[PDB]
Every structure is written in C-alpha cells, then in structure tokens.
From Swiss-Prot:
It comes from Homo sapiens (Human). The gene is CA2. CDD domains: alpha_CA_I_II_III_XIII. Its cofactor is Zn(2+); Co(2+). This is Carbonic anhydrase 2. Changing residue 89 to Y: In OPTB3; partial loss of activity.
Length: 255
C-alpha cells in the first residue's frame, strides 16, 4: 500500500528490484531529452475497444477490457509489434498540487492515467510481464481546469466500487474520450510502478495533459484503500515518487 509504514519507501524489502536499473517513474527533464527523428507516430486503434468491468483492487481502480482478440491496440512509436489494451487506471493526490507519478521538469500534475497494453507475441499478460519488451504503458497527465466529458461515466460509477474488492459491470466505455488532441510523446524503458515492479515496460508519456474539473478529481478521493467493514482509509496519494534515471536516455518524438 501507500501508508507511512508500507508505502513505496518500504517496497524494496519484499521486492529488491525496487532498487533496480530501470525503475519508474522518473522526472522528465525536457532540456536533456533527445529528439529522435527516427521515432514513428503512435498508432492508437481503439474503435473496437470492449470494456467489461471496473474494479477497486485496493491500490487504484482499473477499467478492464476484453484482450482476447486484437480489438484495441497500440502500434508504432518506439514499439515493434502489436500491443493489446488490457486495463487503465489512474494515480492521484490528496491535493491538486500532486498526484502524478512522472514529473516534467519537476512539475507534478493532479493525476496520471495509465493505459496498459501487452505485446501479443507473448500470448498473455502473465508471460509478457516477464519480458523486457512485454508491456507498453501510455501515460497521460491530468491538470485541474475544465471538466472532461468523456471521463464522467467513470466518475459516476465510483460509488458502486468504494471499497477494495468491489467490482461493477462497465460496458461500452470508449477510451478515445480520454486522449489529448496531440500524440507527441517522450519514451524511455522502465518498470511497473506498483509491486512486483518488473522491468518490462516501454513507457510512452504524452506531452499534452488533459483537463478535468475539481469536482471530477474530488470524486476519486472518496474511494477507500480498505475493504468493506474495515476502518476507512481514503484512497489518495497512490503514486510512487520519481526514481533515478541511471543509465537511460529519454527520447522525444517532437522538437
Ligand atoms: Zn499506474
């Protein structure tokens, strides 16, 4: 979890890879990122996306998709091959001034959306996480301002999954409603940002944030880390701090 006695600063004791060479998130220093003209544009094909369910797993809430066929896929950019969307989730703060996992020149956003995809050549998500190129996660920053209409269906169902382990049917949700206008991105190799912290992720972090209203993000902060009938602990600040870049270069698709 993310408390004072089991937060990210303790994870290394159970998951020694927490101190590894390609851990995420990181600070993106925009002046030392390298423009790489050989990076292709991202290809996001989400028209046939089939959402199934939304679940409070005690760390965040996940919206899960049917990933048994190539329905919603990410290609191009720095990627070789086809990556299927399996779930998305957010990280957010107790205050608007924090919540994102990645930072841009040390600037924190109010929240960060992760669309998680796995490389179809490995057959399933479980095998993919064991490979250095197993996952691609698209990261999108949220700043507080105008409401995001395409997010509201998610906000409205949160009441039904308040506590850990609760799930609700969540069909016909279109993830295209959560993308910014521009798909310019930074990319670097990294890890999952929750345990088991495996170093299997190609990160693709979009330069343009989306805006959500204060009321929308306030509703995220009413969820609970705990299960029903346990003492209430609000689900806030479920973000891991920036880790050292070590021997990695962040590349940019844009100048
Ligand atoms: Zn995440």
């Amino acid at each position: 979890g993310y408390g004072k006695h089991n937060g990210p600063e303790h994870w290394h004791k159970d998951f020694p890879i927490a101190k590894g060479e390609r851990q995420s998130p990181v600070d993106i220093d925009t002046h030392t990122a390298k423009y790489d003209p050989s990076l292709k544009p991202l290809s996001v094909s989400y028209d046939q996306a089939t959402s199934l369910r939304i679940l409070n797993n005690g760390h965040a809430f996940n919206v899960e998709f049917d990933d048994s066929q190539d329905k919603a896929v990410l290609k191009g950019g720095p990627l070789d091959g086809t990556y299927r969307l399996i779930q998305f989730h957010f990280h957010w703060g107790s205050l608007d001034g924090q919540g994102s996992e990645h930072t841009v020149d040390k600037k924190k956003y109010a929240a960060e959306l992760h669309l998680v995809h796995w490389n179809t050549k490995y057959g399933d998500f479980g095998k993919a996480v064991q490979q250095p190129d197993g996952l691609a996660v698209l990261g999108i920053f949220l700043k507080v301002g105008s409401a995001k209409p395409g997010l509201q269906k998610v906000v409205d169902v949160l009441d039904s999954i308040k506590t850990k382990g609760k799930s609700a049917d969540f069909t016909n949700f279109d993830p295209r409603g959560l993308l910014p206008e521009s798909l310019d991105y930074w990319t670097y190799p990294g890890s999952l940002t929750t345990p088991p912290l495996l170093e299997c992720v190609t990160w693709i972090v979009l330069k343009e944030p989306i805006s959500v209203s204060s009321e929308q993000v306030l509703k995220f902060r009413k969820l609970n880390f705990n299960g029903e009938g346990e003492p209430e602990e609000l689900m806030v600040d479920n973000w891991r701090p920036a880790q050292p870049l070590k021997n990695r270069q962040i590349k940019a698709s844009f100048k």
